């Protein structure tokens, strides 16, 4: 029977039907995982033959099973039962799995037991036990893969300097200037578990010391020196979980016969887990429930964040155009060009807005300008006005777009006249208690045309011969007063009750003698 099974050749995948599509592949109607190593010298190694067959005959709860081997000359590789989640080191290091310490204790104990079985049978502890080769099952039962099959790996000094990239967990004794044995040492196992426990206890990569970080070269050489102090990454200075620190301590010292057996290791682990170490069945359920709850909370927080971006993205493109645009993009395809000539516009400036303001002191007025912007905008929400521009010389607001009515705009302009008269006595310069600046404004009705231009950041533009004429005529505005023209005067006539006075016949550049009026209230 033994001879027959050994001759059976039950480990040959033969890499013919298997389809490739870190590099997961599909074979045996199941998810697979294949890792290979550059070697072209395999033979029918009797010892390795038994090792391969025995591995294929090894099973346990916390181990990881085998499938088949790559005997083809294209390559040679293992076939392993892929598991969904990534390497454990990634698992903890993501900072997005929101672990808990009961969770971690259970993981440590499970890995302990799996290794223990790994060490109680014909297969003995594997050489390397890096924290980055402990996979998590779909049902979340820790497994320790990539072990055994001695002659099946890239056992090589070839890389030379590059070898020092990945040996950090190597047992200190084995990591000396000597040719190592493939199998490894049980002391090596104790050290491996100690270092992995450290990494799963501090939650930062490998050898996370806050005082001084050092590349792999530095850590390797430091470990190698064998200095009097027991070099190893430090333990958080707290008494909350001293037991685990002590247990790791017993596994670190270079005393080869000091790293204990796993009998006492499991004994101390159970003594600690007596806090919550209850059952062997329900553990899976509670663990998965905790993990799922945390994942759902994380995704809820991300989804909350995503809405935050949408509102801000909206605030840039849509908001530039008048709020009629707010409909235009908000299913307002009907929000298009207009031909309404009953539009009232207020363009005003600060008497000596620039010269004195800039000359007073560098960088001593810009904040005040922002304050004026904010306050006068808040008032700008006190009336139905779609502010047009805030040009350096002046800001110009014209209304009427939000409601297609020829009576609302005139009343809005008339009201804003008195509102600006008040603003004259509003937003006094805080920095200079003895400092006052007055605003001059004017209104000029007439035909106008509004339309949306621009591709990247389209904006509304409101052009009109009346607009240009109003600018050219109001360029001579006086302080703390308002000038109205004939068109706007007629607007006021039918707009509603008001107290307008007659300034007289003002000679306007390009307009000639124009009768003008003062708005009192």
Ligand X SMILES: Nc1ncnc2c1ncn2[C@@H]1O[C@H](COP(=O)(O)OP(=O)(O)OP(=O)(O)O)[C@@H](O)[C@H]1O
Q: Where on the chain is the footprint of ligand X (CB under 6 A)?
A: 22, 33, 35, 80, 82-83, 86-87, 128, 130, 132-133, 135, 145-146, 154
Taking the complex as a whole, the smallest distance from the CB of residue 296 to ligand X amounts, in Å, to 15
Instruction: Report CA-CA distances (Å) from 393 to 39, 351, 442.
Output: 78, 10, 14
Taking the complex as a whole, the smallest distance from the CB of residue 75 to ligand X amounts, in Å, to 14
Nearest to 442 by CA among 342, 367, 343, 517: 517
Distance CA(170)–CA(130), nearest Å, equals: 8
**Residue 471 binding target from its own copies, ligand X, none, CB below 5 to 8 Å by type:** its own copies
In the chain, what's the furthest Cα-to-Cα distance? 123
Size of the site for its own copies (CB under 8 A): 70
310 in contact with its own copies (CB under 8 A): yes
Piece of 21-29, 169-177, 317-325, 478-486 that binds its own copies (CB under 8 A): 317-325
**C-beta of 99 vs 284, nearer to its own copies:** 284
First CA to last CA distance, the chain: 113
**C-beta of 140 vs 272, nearer to ligand X:** 140
Distance CA(15)–CA(12), nearest Å, equals: 8
Quick one: how far is CA 306 from the chain centroid? 11
Angle between helices 486-495 and 408-423 (to 10 degrees): 110
Taking the complex as a whole, the smallest distance from the CB of residue 143 to its own copies amounts, in Å, to 16
138 in contact with its own copies (CB under 8 A): yes
Nearest to 261 by CA among 153, 165, 186, 194: 186
Q: What angle do CA 464, 393, 511 make, to 5 degrees?
A: 45
370 in contact with its own copies (CB under 8 A): yes
**Residue 464 binding target from its own copies, ligand X, none, CB below 5 to 8 Å by type:** its own copies
Distance CA(106)–CA(83), nearest Å, equals: 19
DSSP E strand boundaries for 318-476: 345-350, 386-389, 395-398, 439-443, 449-453, 459-463
**Residue 154 binding target from ligand X, its own copies, none, CB below 5 to 8 Å by type:** ligand X
Three-state DSSP class for residue 370: helix
Three-state DSSP class for residue 76: coil
Q: Where the chain is broken, by preceding residue (C–N > 2.5 Å)?
A: 21
Distance CA(128)–CA(339), nearest Å, equals: 81
176 in contact with its own copies (CB under 8 A): no
Residue 395's DSSP bridge partners are 348
**C-beta of 128 vs 516, nearer to ligand X:** 128
Nearest to 42 by CA among 76, 74, 66, 78: 76
**C-beta of 210 vs 289, nearer to its own copies:** 289
Distance CA(325)–CA(379), nearest Å, equals: 21
7 in contact with its own copies (CB under 8 A): no
**C-beta of 85 vs 270, nearer to ligand X:** 85
According to CB under 8 A, which residues from 69 to 88 bind its own copies?
A: 84
Taking the complex as a whole, the smallest distance from the CB of residue 109 to ligand X amounts, in Å, to 20
Given a contact cutoff of 8 angstroms between Cβ atoms, the answer to whether 88 and 71 are in contact is: no
103 in contact with its own copies (CB under 8 A): no
Cβ atoms < 10 Å from Cβ of 199: 23
**Residue 80 binding target from its own copies, ligand X, none, CB below 5 to 8 Å by type:** ligand X
**Residues 10, 163, 182, 369: which binds its own copies (CB under 8 A)?**
369
**C-beta of 146 vs 474, nearer to its own copies:** 474
Quick one: how far is CA 130 from the chain centroid? 29
**C-beta of 237 vs 305, nearer to its own copies:** 305
Taking the complex as a whole, the smallest distance from the CB of residue 117 to its own copies amounts, in Å, to 22
Site string for its own copies, 329-368 (x = CB under 8 A): -------xx-x--------------xx-xxx--xx-xx--
Piece of 123-131, 155-163, 370-378, 434-442 that binds its own copies (CB under 8 A): 370-378
320 in contact with its own copies (CB under 8 A): yes
CA atoms within 13 A on the CB side of 225: 11
Taking the complex as a whole, the smallest distance from the CB of residue 483 to its own copies amounts, in Å, to 19
Distance CA(108)–CA(62), nearest Å, equals: 12
Given a contact cutoff of 8 angstroms between Cβ atoms, the answer to whether 173 and 252 are in contact is: no
**Residues 182, 209, 236, 288: which binds its own copies (CB under 8 A)?**
288
Taking the complex as a whole, the smallest distance from the CB of residue 64 to ligand X amounts, in Å, to 6
**Residues 5, 57, 289, 494: which binds its own copies (CB under 8 A)?**
289
381 in contact with its own copies (CB under 8 A): no
Taking the complex as a whole, the smallest distance from the CB of residue 455 to ligand X amounts, in Å, to 41
Close Cβ partners of 352 (under 8 Å, ≥ 6 residues apart): 437
Binding site for its own copies (CB under 8 A): 84, 138-139, 281, 284-286, 288-289, 291-293, 295-296, 298-299, 302-303, 305-306, 309-310, 312-313, 315-317, 319-320, 336-337, 339, 354-355, 357-359, 362-363, 365-366, 369-370, 372-374, 388-393, 448-449, 451, 453-457, 459, 461-465, 467-469, 471
């Amino acid at each position: 029977q033994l001879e027959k099974e050994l001759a059976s050749e039950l480990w040959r995948v033969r890499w013919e039907d298997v389809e490739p599509s870190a590099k997961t592949a599909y074979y045996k109607g199941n998810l697979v995982a294949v890792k290979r190593v550059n070697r072209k010298r395999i033979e029918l190694t009797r010892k390795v033959l038994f090792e391969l067959k025995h591995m294929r005959d090894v099973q346990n709860e916390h181990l990881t099973r085998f499938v088949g081997a790559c005997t083809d000359p294209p390559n040679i590789c293992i076939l392993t039962e892929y598991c969904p989640r990534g390497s454990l080191q990634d698992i903890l290091e993501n900072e997005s799995i929101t672990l808990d310490w009961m969770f971690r204790y259970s993981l440590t104990n499970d890995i302990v037991k799996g290794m223990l079985f790994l060490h109680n049978g014909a297969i003995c502890s594997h050489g390397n036990l890096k924290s980055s080769n402990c996979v998590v099952d779909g049902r979340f039962v820790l497994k320790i893969t990539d072990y055994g099959l001695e002659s099946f790996r890239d056992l090589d000094p070839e890389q030379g300097h590059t070898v020092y990239a990945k040996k950090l967990w190597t047992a200190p004794e084995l990591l000396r200037m000597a040719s190592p044995p493939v199998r490894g040492s049980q002391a090596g196992d104790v050290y491996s578990f100690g270092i992995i426990l450290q990494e799963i206890a501090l939650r930062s990569g490998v050898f996370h010391v806050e005082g001084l970080d050092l590349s792999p070269k530095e850590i390797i050489e430091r470990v190698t020196r064998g200095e009097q102090p027991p070099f190893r990454p430090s333990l958080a200075l707290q008494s909350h979980l001293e037991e685990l620190g002590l247990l790791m301590q017993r596994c670190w010292a270079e005393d080869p016969q000091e790293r204990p057996p796993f009998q006492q290791i499991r004994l101390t682990l159970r003594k600690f887990n007596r806090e919550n170490s209850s059952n062997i069945l329900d553990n899976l359920l509670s663990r998965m429930e905790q993990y799922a709850n945390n994942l759902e909370e994380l995704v809820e927080e991300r989804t909350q964040a995503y809405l935050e971006e949408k509102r801000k993205a909206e605030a840039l493109l849509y908001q530039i155009l008048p709020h009629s645009v707010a409909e235009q993009l908000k299913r307002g395809e009907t929000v298009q060009a207009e031909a309404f000539d009953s539009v009232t516009i207020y363009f005003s400036d600060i008497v000596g807005f620039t010269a004195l303001s800039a000359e007073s002191t560098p960088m001593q007025v810009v904040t005040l300008l922002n304050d004026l912007y904010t306050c006068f905008d808040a008032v700008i929400d006190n009336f139905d006005v779609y502010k047009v521009e805030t040009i350096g010389d002046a800001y110009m607001v014209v209304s009427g777009l939000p409601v297609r009515n020829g009576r609302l705009h005139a009343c809005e302009v008339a009201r804003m006249a008195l509102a600006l008269l008040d603003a004259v006595r509003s937003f006094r310069i805080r920095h200079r208690p003895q400092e006052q600046l007055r605003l001059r404004i004017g209104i000029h009705t007439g035909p106008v045309c509004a339309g949306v231009v621009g591709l990247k950041m389209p904006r509304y533009c409101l052009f009109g011969d009346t607009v240009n004429t109003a600018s050219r005529m109001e360029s001579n505005g006086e302080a703390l007063k308002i000038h109205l023209s004939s068109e706007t005067k007629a607007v006021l006539e039918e707009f509603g009750g008001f107290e307008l006075e007659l300034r007289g016949d003002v000679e306007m550049k390009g307009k000639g003698k124009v009768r003008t009026y003062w708005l009192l209230g």
